[PDB]
């Protein structure tokens, strides 16, 4: 298939939608690692493997300020925390488990919400 919708339709509609995916992600039993900032100064690899590290510790603060109230806008930083953290974290030891679960659970919401449209 080939369509790539990713249309949030209404901005406000996304505000509470991303708040929905996040609200369950913030209280997720595996989002603990995503609730903190990396080093951004002594963390080798970033600024190269982690284009947009991001993290609920600082990202969740935007949903309150409507800094990511759209399609890829919010999914970019969130999907980034999942795809960039896995770009280095073990393929399945301690970090992958969270990025795997969170990426799996929030999917049903962003997919039904109209974020992944896949």
């Amino acid at each position: 298939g080939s369509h790539m919708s990713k249309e949030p339709r209404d901005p406000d509609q996304l505000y509470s939608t991303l708040k929905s995916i996040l609200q369950q992600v913030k209280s997720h039993q595996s989002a603990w690692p995503f609730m903190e900032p990396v080093k951004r100064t002594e963390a080798p690899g970033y600024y190269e493997v982690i284009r947009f590290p991001m993290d609920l510790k600082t990202m969740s603060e935007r949903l309150k300020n409507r800094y990511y109230v759209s399609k890829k806008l919010f999914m970019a930083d969130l999907q980034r925390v999942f795809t960039n953290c896995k770009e280095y974290n073990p393929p399945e030891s301690e970090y992958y488990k969270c990025a795997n679960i969170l990426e799996k659970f929030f999917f049903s919401k962003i997919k039904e919400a109209g974020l992944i449209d896949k």
């Binding site: 100064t41 963390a43 690899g45 493997v49 982690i50 953290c85 770009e87 280095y88 974290n89």
Partner: peptide
């Protein structure tokens, strides 16, 4: 070498 995710490098 790749990401790090460790303690704070004390310089």
């Amino acid at each position: 070498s790749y990401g790090r995710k460790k303690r704070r490098q004390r310089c």
